Amino acid sequence: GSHMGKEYFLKVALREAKRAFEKGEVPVGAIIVKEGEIISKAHNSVEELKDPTAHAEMLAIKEACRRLNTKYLEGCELYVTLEPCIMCSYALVLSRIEKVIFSALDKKHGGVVSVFNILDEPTLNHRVKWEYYPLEEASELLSEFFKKLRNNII
Amino acid sequence: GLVPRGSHMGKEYFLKVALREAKRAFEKGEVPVGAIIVKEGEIISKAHNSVEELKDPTAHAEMLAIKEACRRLNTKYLEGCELYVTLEPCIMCSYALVLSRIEKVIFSALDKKHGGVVSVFNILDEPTLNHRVKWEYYPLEEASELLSEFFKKLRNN
Ligand SMILES: [Zn+2]
Ligand SMILES: [Zn+2]
């Protein structure tokens, strides 16, 4: 088959971020993969669900747990278009995700390499591995979103 | 001054309502944590840890209560709301308070292991946040004992 590595799965996540952008949401997409199979896909849906916690990662985790009928996502990898925020980073620990791969950094809310290094905190019983795999399109989606925000505010 | 008015119930009263939710969790076989959201003295939502029932690692009491309050008030921001929880919010829930713009969180026991307010991380006192969530540790030993009893019934099986 064709190459289904990190760029491929992040590209799939980018489609979810695109969908979010089209829906007027902050453009972040996430997918959960287990043994090369996509288990769930989700996008930031804060605006449509009127729920500040409805970040892509959170929705993806809930759907994966629902499909696998399990509270833990051991052996699963999460691919997200933007570095997970503090809330989502700890959700990864709680769900026991194996690894998270992200394509852009979040300087003000990131909980992996930016504001806090939540995933590397010693006290943690389960250790979520991570990888920053930058993709130009992920950052451009965010930059375009903020240009739209400015234009929509007098 | 044309209608009746009264003082809002006290912190102990609301924490006791939360403890009731926590006991329900205990009886349902989950981590015994309960939480409620109050706005202008009125209880908007109540919830308890439902991770096992829902098979959802994110279903902590605070998360469920916030989602329910946002839905009942038809808004993503809970400005003016206070959250009472029987255990110090974990890191995930602590930031959820920030994202939801909750005004203050009041808790009755500490979580030395996952605590995100004063124990592991001080998520609320992070000057990076635009919204500052106020917090208060209002100790009630009964809340700590409920958690200890749970963990005890854990090993003893
Ligand atoms: Zn997040
Ligand atoms: Zn929590």
Swiss-Prot record, chain A:
The active site is at E57 (proton donor). The lineage of its organism: Bacteria, Pseudomonadati, Aquificota, Aquificia, Aquificales. It comes from the Bacteria. The gene is tadA. Catalyzes the deamination of adenosine to inosine at the wobble position 34 of tRNA(Arg2). This is tRNA-specific adenosine deaminase. Keywords: Hydrolase, Metal-binding, tRNA processing, Zinc. Its cofactor is Zn(2+). Pfam families: MafB19-deam (PF14437).
From Swiss-Prot, chain B:
Binds 1 zinc ion per subunit. It catalyses: adenosine(34) in tRNA + H2O + H(+) = inosine(34) in tRNA + NH4(+). HAMAP family: tRNA_aden_deaminase (MF_00972). The keyword tRNA processing applies. Coiled coil: none annotated. This is tRNA-specific adenosine deaminase. It holds the Pfam family MafB19-deam. It comes from Aquifex aeolicus (strain VF5). Catalyzes the deamination of adenosine to inosine at the wobble position 34 of tRNA(Arg2). PANTHER family: CYTOSINE DEAMINASE FAMILY MEMBER (PTHR11079), TRNA-SPECIFIC ADENOSINE DEAMINASE (PTHR11079:SF202). The lineage of its organism: Bacteria, Pseudomonadati, Aquificota, Aquificia, Aquificales. The keyword Aminoacyl-tRNA synthetase does not apply. Keywords: Hydrolase, Metal-binding, tRNA processing, Zinc.
